[PDB]
Design an enzyme around this catalytic site. Structure first.
Site, PDB file in Angstrom:
ATOM      1  CD  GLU A 177      -2.669  -1.167  -0.265  1.00 34.78           C
ATOM      2  OE1 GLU A 177      -2.842  -0.115  -0.912  1.00 34.78           O
ATOM      3  OE2 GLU A 177      -2.994  -2.291  -0.700  1.00 34.78           O
TER       4      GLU A 177
ATOM      5  CG  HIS B 248      -0.710   1.041  -4.756  1.00 34.06           C
ATOM      6  ND1 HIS B 248      -0.428   0.664  -6.052  1.00 34.06           N
ATOM      7  CD2 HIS B 248      -1.379   0.003  -4.201  1.00 34.06           C
ATOM      8  CE1 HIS B 248      -0.906  -0.548  -6.271  1.00 34.06           C
ATOM      9  NE2 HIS B 248      -1.487  -0.972  -5.164  1.00 34.06           N
TER      10      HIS B 248
ATOM     11  CB  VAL C 181      15.767  -2.512  16.018  1.00 33.41           C
ATOM     12  CG1 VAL C 181      16.452  -3.687  15.311  1.00 33.41           C
ATOM     13  CG2 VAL C 181      14.457  -2.966  16.649  1.00 33.41           C
TER      14      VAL C 181
ATOM     15  CG  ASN D  78      16.812  -0.189  12.850  1.00 30.09           C
ATOM     16  OD1 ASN D  78      17.893   0.403  12.843  1.00 30.09           O
ATOM     17  ND2 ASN D  78      15.760   0.245  13.535  1.00 30.09           N
TER      18      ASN D  78
ATOM     19  CG  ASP E 230      22.204  28.706   1.019  1.00 30.53           C
ATOM     20  OD1 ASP E 230      22.148  27.629   0.387  1.00 30.53           O
ATOM     21  OD2 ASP E 230      22.349  28.759   2.259  1.00 30.53           O
TER      22      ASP E 230
ATOM     23  CG  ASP F  32      20.439  25.600   4.933  1.00 31.54           C
ATOM     24  OD1 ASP F  32      19.837  25.041   3.989  1.00 31.54           O
ATOM     25  OD2 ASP F  32      21.243  26.543   4.762  1.00 31.54           O
TER      26      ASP F  32
HETATM   27 CA   LIG Z   1      18.819   1.172  14.938  1.00 32.94          CA
HETATM   28 CA   LIG Z   2      23.237  27.753   4.324  1.00 35.21          CA
HETATM   29 ZN   LIG Z   3      -2.315  -2.921  -5.107  1.00 38.38          ZN
END
Ligand SMILES: [Ca+2]
Ligand SMILES: [Ca+2]
Ligand SMILES: [Zn+2]
Ligand SMILES: *[C@@H]1O[C@H](CO[C@@H]2O[C@@H](C)[C@@H](O)[C@@H](O)[C@@H]2O)[C@@H](O[C@@H]2O[C@H](CO)[C@@H](O[C@@H]3O[C@H](CO[C@H]4O[C@H](CO)[C@@H](O)[C@H](O)[C@@H]4O[C@@H]4O[C@H](CO)[C@@H](O)[C@H](O)[C@H]4NC(C)=O)[C@@H](O[C@@H]4O[C@H](CO)[C@@H](O)[C@H](O)[C@H]4NC(C)=O)[C@H](O[C@H]4O[C@H](CO)[C@@H](O)[C@H](O)[C@@H]4O[C@@H]4O[C@H](CO)[C@@H](O)[C@H](O)[C@H]4NC(C)=O)[C@@H]3O)[C@H](O)[C@H]2NC(C)=O)[C@H](O)[C@H]1NC(C)=O
Ligand SMILES: [Ca+2]
Length: 415
Positions: A140, A143, A209, A212, A273, A288
Site C-alpha cells: 500500500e 502505491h 533496534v 535496522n 545562502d 542551514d
Molecule cells: Ca537502529
Molecule cells: Ca546555508
Molecule cells: Zn495494489
C-alpha cells in the site's frame, strides 16, 4: 546519501483492539515488528521506514470504519489532514483495521507520498503471520510512492514480489525491478520533499533496534546486519563505534573521523545562502542559515527569498537555455486573459487572471534573440505541471517590489 526516509504513523482501529482482547501492549509490540520488516523490504528501494507515531483507537474510532474501502480510505485521509497531521508531523499514515473489507484487503492512493490527505492507505489485519501483513503494508505504501502492480516479465527472483495484484500465500520481502525503477521515476519527476529528512532518534516511537540501519537513541552507529554492514567505523553486531573512531555517520564524518574545521558540508545555493562548514568537533553539519529575505542580491537585480535570488533573466535561462532574455512588458499582458497559461494564481482549482498591476507575477515570457526566430513572447506551459514556467515567488517584478502569491508587492511589506 542516496536513502530516503518515510516517517510513518500507524493508526489501529477499535476492531483491532477488540480482536486482540484489549491487550494494547501486544498490539504495540506487533506493530513495532511489522514496521521493522517493512523497513527491511524497502532496503532494496534505498528507502527507510521509521515509526514516528502509533495511535490506537481503543475507545472509539475517530472515523467510521466501513467495509467499503473507498469510503474508509477517503475518511481516513480527511482525518489525517484535519486532525492527525495537525498535532504530529509525519510523511505517511496507514490504518490497520480488523474489519473484513469488501473485495479488497487494502487500499491506497497512488503517487501521493507527502500529500496531506492522499499520503495514506488502509490495511486489513488479514493474517496472523506478521510477514503477510507487513507485505500488505509495504504494498500500500508502494502505491503511495507512485508504484503500480507487477505484470509481464517483472521479477524479483523466483519469489512472489510485493507489488503483485494479489498477496501470495507464500509472500517474500522482495520488490520487482519494475517497482524499483517505477518508484524512483516517481521521486525523480514528482519531488516527495517530505521524505528527504533523516528522522531523529527521539522521533522514533518504536524501541530502538540495532541493525535496522536506523541510527536510534542509545546507539553510536547502525550499519545494518554484520553481513550488510559497509561501515568501517561501526561494529554492526553491537551498534558501537570501533575503538578510536570519533564518528560513524554525518556530513562531517570522514573515514570515522571529524572533518577538518572549516570543511564545507552544505554548499551555497546562491549569495543569499551562506554555506555551512564543519566545526571539527562534531560529525553533524551546522543548521542551514539563510540571509534575510528582501535583501538586495545579484547586483541589485533581485531580493533574497528563502536562500535564493530569483530574477527574470535566470528564470528564462533555466527554461530555454542561454542567449534567452526577459520579454517586453507588453508580452506580460497575456496574463490578464486568465486562460490556460496566462493567469496569476489558482483558487481551489480555478485560474485567476492577473490584474494590470500584478502582470509581471503570472506566466513568465521570454524573448529569443536568434536569427529569424520571430516569437517575442516565448513561454512555457505543460498540463503535466502548470506551475512550471510560472514566475518564481520573490522575483523582483519592479523596483522595490517582489512577487508574492501572484501579486507584485513592496518588498518592505512582503516579509
Ligand atoms: Ca537502529
Ligand atoms: Ca546555508
Ligand atoms: Zn495494489
Ligand atoms: C526486469 O528484469 C527482468 C529480468 O529478470 C530476470 O529473470 C528473472 C526470472 C529473475 O531470475 C531475475 O533475477 C532476472 O534478472 C526483465 O525480464 C525480461 O523482460 C523481457 C520483456 O520486457 C522478456 O522478453 C520477452 O520474453 C517473452 C518470452 O520469450 C522468452 O520465453 C519463451 C518461452 O519460454 C522463449 O521461447 C523465448 O525464446 C524467450 O526466451 C528468452 O530469450 C531471451 C533472449 O535474450 C533470454 O535472455 C531469456 O533468458 C529467455 N527466457 C526464457 C523464458 O528462457 C517474449 O514473448 C514471446 O515472443 C515469442 C515471439 O518472439 C512468442 O512466440 C511467444 O509466444 C512469446 N512468449 C510469451 C509467453 O509471451 C517477448 O517477445 C514478444 O514480445 C515483445 C515485446 O517486448 C515483442 O517485441 C515481440 O514481437 C515478441 O512477440 C510478440 O509479443 C506480443 C506481446 O508483446 C504478442 O502480442 C505478439 O503476439 C507476439 N508476436 C509474435 C512474435 O509471435 C520478449 O522477448 C525477457 O525474456 C525477460 N527476461 C527474463 C530472464 O525473463 C524485465 O524486462 C525487467 N523489467 C524492467 C523494465 O526493468
Ligand atoms: Ca520526513
Amino acid at each position: 546519501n542516496p536513502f530516503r526516509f518515510v516517517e510513518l504513523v500507524l493508526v489501529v482501529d477499535k476492531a483491532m483492539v477488540t480482536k486482540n482482547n484489549g491487550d494494547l501492549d501486544k498490539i504495540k509490540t506487533r506493530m513495532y515488528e511489522i514496521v521493522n520488516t517493512v523497513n527491511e523490504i524497502y532496503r532494496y528501494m534505498y528507502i527507510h521506514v521509521a515509526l514516528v507515531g502509533l495511535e490506537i483507537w481503543s475507545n472509539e474510532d475517530k472515523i467510521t470504519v466501513k467495509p467499503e474501502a473507498g469510503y474508509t480510505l477517503n475518511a481516513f485521509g480527511e482525518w489525517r489532514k484535519t486532525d492527525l497531521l495537525t498535532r504530529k508531523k509525519h510523511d505517511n499514515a496507514q490504518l490497520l483495521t480488523a474489519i473484513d473489507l469488501d473485495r479488497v484487503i487494502g487500499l491506497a492512493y497512488v503517487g501521493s507520498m507527502c500529500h496531506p490527505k492522499r499520503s495514506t492507505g488502509i490495511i486489513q489485519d488479514y493474517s496472523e503471520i506478521n510477514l503477510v501483513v507487513a507485505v500488505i503494508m509495504a504494498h500500500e505504501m508502494g502505491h503511495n510512492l507512485g508504484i503500480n502492480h507487477d505484470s509481464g516479465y517483472c521479477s524479483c527472483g523466483d519469489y512472489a514480489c510485493i507489488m503483485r495484484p494479489e498477496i501470495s500465500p507464500e509472500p517474500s520481502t522482495f520488490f520487482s525491478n519494475c517497482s524499483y525503477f517505477e518508484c524512483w521515476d516517481f521521486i525523480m519527476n514528482h519531488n516527495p520533499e517530505c521524505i528527504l529528512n533523516e528522522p531523529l532518534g527521539t522521533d522514533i516511537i518504536s524501541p530502538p533496534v540495532c541493525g535496522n540501519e536506523l541510527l536510534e537513541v542509545g546507539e553510536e552507529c547502525d550499519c545494518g546486519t554484520p553481513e550488510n554492514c559497509q561501515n568501517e567505523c561501526c561494529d554492526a553486531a553491537t551498534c558501537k563505534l570501533k575503538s578510536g573512531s570519533q564518528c560513524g555517520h554525518g556530513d562531517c564524518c570522514e573515514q570515522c573521523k571529524f572533518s577538518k574545521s572549516g570543511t564545507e558540508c552544505r554548499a551555497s545555493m546562491s549569495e543569499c545562502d551562506p554555506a555551512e562548514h564543519c566545526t571539527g568537533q562534531s560529525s553533524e553539519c551546522p543548521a542551514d542559515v539563510f540571509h534575510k529575505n528582501g535583501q538586495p542580491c545579484l547586483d541589485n537585480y533581485g531580493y533574497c527569498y528563502n536562500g535564493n535570488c530569483p530574477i527574470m533573466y535566470h528564470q528564462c535561462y533555466d527554461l530555454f537555455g542561454a542567449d534567452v532574455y526577459e520579454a517586453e512588458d507588453s508580452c506580460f499582458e497575456r496574463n490578464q486573459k486568465g486562460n490556460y497559461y496566462g493567469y496569476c494564481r489558482k483558487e481551489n482549482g480555478n485560474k485567476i487572471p492577473c490584474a494590470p498591476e500584478d502582470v509581471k507575477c503570472g506566466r513568465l515570457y521570454c524573448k529569443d534573440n536568434s536569427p529569424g526566430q520571430n516569437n517575442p513572447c516565448k513561454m512555457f506551459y505543460s498540463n503535466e505541471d502548470e506551475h512550471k514556467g510560472m514566475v518564481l515567488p520573490g522575483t523582483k517584478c519592479a523596483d522595490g517590489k517582489v512577487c508574492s502569491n501572484g501579486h507584485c508587492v513592496d518588498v518592505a511589506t512582503a516579509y
